[PDB]
Design brief:
Blueprint: no helix or strand
């Protein structure tokens, strides 16, 4: 499964 974004630290959006 792809990432779900935990926070600004991990959110390539």
């Amino acid at each position: 499964s792809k990432w779900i974004c935990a926070n600004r630290s991990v959110c390539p959006i």
